[PDB]
Subunit: 217 residues, 4 copies
Amino acid sequence: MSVIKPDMKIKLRMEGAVNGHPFAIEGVGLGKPFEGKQSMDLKVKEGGPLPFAYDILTTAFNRVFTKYPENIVDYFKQSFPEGYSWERSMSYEDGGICIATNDITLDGDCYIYEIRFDGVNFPANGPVMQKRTVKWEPSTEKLYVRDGVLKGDVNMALSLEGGGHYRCDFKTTYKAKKVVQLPDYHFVDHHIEIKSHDKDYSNVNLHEHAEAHSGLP
Amino acid sequence: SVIKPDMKIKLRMEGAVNGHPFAIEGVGLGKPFEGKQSMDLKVKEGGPLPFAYDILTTAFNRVFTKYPENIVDYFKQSFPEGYSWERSMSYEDGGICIATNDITLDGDCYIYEIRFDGVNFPANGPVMQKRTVKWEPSTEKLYVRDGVLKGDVNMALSLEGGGHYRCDFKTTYKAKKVVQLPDYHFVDHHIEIKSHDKDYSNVNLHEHAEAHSGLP
Amino acid sequence: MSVIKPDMKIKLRMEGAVNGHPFAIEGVGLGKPFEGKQSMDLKVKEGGPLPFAYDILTTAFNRVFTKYPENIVDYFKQSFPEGYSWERSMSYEDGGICIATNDITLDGDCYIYEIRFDGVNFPANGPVMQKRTVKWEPSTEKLYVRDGVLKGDVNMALSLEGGGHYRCDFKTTYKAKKVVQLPDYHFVDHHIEIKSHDKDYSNVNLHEHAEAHSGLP
Amino acid sequence: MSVIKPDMKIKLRMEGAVNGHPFAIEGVGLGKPFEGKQSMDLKVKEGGPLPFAYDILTTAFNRVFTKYPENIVDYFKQSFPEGYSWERSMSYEDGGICIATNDITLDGDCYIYEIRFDGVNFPANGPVMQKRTVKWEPSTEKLYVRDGVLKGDVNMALSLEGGGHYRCDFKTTYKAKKVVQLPDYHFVDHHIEIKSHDKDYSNVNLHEHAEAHSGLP
Ligand SMILES: [K+]
Ligand SMILES: [K+]
Ligand SMILES: [K+]
Ligand SMILES: [K+]
């Protein structure tokens, strides 16, 4: 009581490949774990310029930054100081598919992410290889316990240039590194936004706002 | 001027699950602007039903959804001509249902013609074993595609003995006339069986639904 | 044991709906069970002229007509005279999805099918509603036992007018009406063909050739 | 002169992660490309003993070793000496999902593979993490052209210890590194087998036999 301060820092490195093309990105940021807000700056270190839509990475760049109510177990805050990991599949409607992992540790006031990201089967003319995405719409993730860990599923949509949406289904498994208390079925509303970026996206400023709830009464 | 603050509902569903035919009729009423509704359902054929009644309930109308001013209400616009929907329901254990509803309006009463079909439910699964408790509340994601409205929702049935059984809904809503097309939005749901008899020949069913646009 | 002839007959009625549009079709045919060949003539009785590619229905119009090698168990011929039923989902790459059931009985030398077929979510501009399909490619179905019944999965593809293919995944459950010996994992090669039809498909002549095998040695 | 001999060699390195646990494997082998047979020895170099069923990896360890008839275009042999790459998703019935990539080059008479393999969401209690798999059944892959490259889809099944099967759907994209003749829709029968292995699977002898065909008749 309590290793989680109302303001905390973040450092990350992501190593990855999309359609066989390796890349690496590093980031530093800060957030307010209790208001469920956070932001960070990201730099492409390898594989620049990135030949695919930068949006497909942004949800990989931590649910501790989630405003939780008193009446809902917070699975992620409990997990610390030791931390937790997640595994995620991201299945796009045109047969594109990404899978990512994050190992999350804590070093004093700073969370440290080790991220692996991989994607394949994106069509050369699809909205990802042509960089035709605008942003992720807001979302509501559904979280439920299975086999003693936490699952989260969310229907995601990328707004497209020239209108319409491009759909993706996320399936995440969250794994506390130690015994914590398990939440009941609940929801997390999200909104992730790229607030600014250069032309090749080599530098990105990224924000997220997330709040948990129990849905309709 | 066809949508009165209090409306009635009449429906018939004809269907089959794992090749077993059945039919259900229902009467109900709701408050379209409050996004609340309820109804009484009676199994007319194929009773007693050999499968979890819960797979049928979401088939038994987004007219009954509370829409804000700032969000276009596709469903209230479609009347008096009305609209139809098509829906696939994909269960994590390979069970799959598809349903259709053709919705018309007669005076103050909505009329549903529903077809429901399901296959490949495992005999030892929670559907055929009837081990479901209720649907969790949900948030549906609605977006336009090819001039019509799509709605996708991550659904989950609570199970006897704990845990959940997941289902992915994909719905297409089709107005039977030209209507204004909404921006990407959400509909929170909560559907509940309030009462039923032992073998579910009689069911009282409630839904509460509200539209919104997510996190500012 | 002997309730099957080297030549047998078929009668069927299918009732169905695609995208909410009801229809009905009847058919009569004959086949050579032990050779795995059959053909039939089909007539639209209701809902004509069908507004969707007829091809989506054709596999719905009996594995009794499969040549089975002596060394593979034949679940299908073995089930008669009590017969069997099947349930099938057919998932198309564009979100279109059909499910169908067949209850198969035997009356003397004639199999009788009671078929229900339903499909939804076919896009208005897609190859099914726009009737742009040419034929099913031949296929190899994979059959395996689960929970004391027989499963069959097959990767299907419709050739398209002006090139390319439109993919569909079939998952079938076959259920004998009496206890039968269960087969080992095996394959059925298929080739289904519309040999002739009239302009709007009110009348169709349909052939299938099917042989079981156990793959590369 | 043809860069493809009747007998050729193979060298590979795979780097990967399953459920967030990294590993690396190297292999050397040889095969007869015009006969569609090949074999190789594999050694775990990092991450061993592998904590998951080795079986999930084996298909990631080259369609060149496929016997093509003369009447079917051979996308793979044509692609050399410049070679080709593939991307593959492998979707398991219990929500486990792997994606892999292979970049294939040619050095003299030795193919060189650079392989990335990633898998997530395999349940702790599943047959992959519990190592309850026996072998892959033989299979028939379906190959078709799309967007000027070659697609291959295959229904796979792992035989399980003490009965039954565990199903996986493969979707592969093959990309020649230069312009080659595109084939028409066809099939490849496969049979992959671990012929021998030591106890924790640090050392594996792996064989594959593959033949192309056009289906019935
Ligand atoms: K863009
Ligand atoms: K129950
Ligand atoms: K056509
Ligand atoms: K084993």
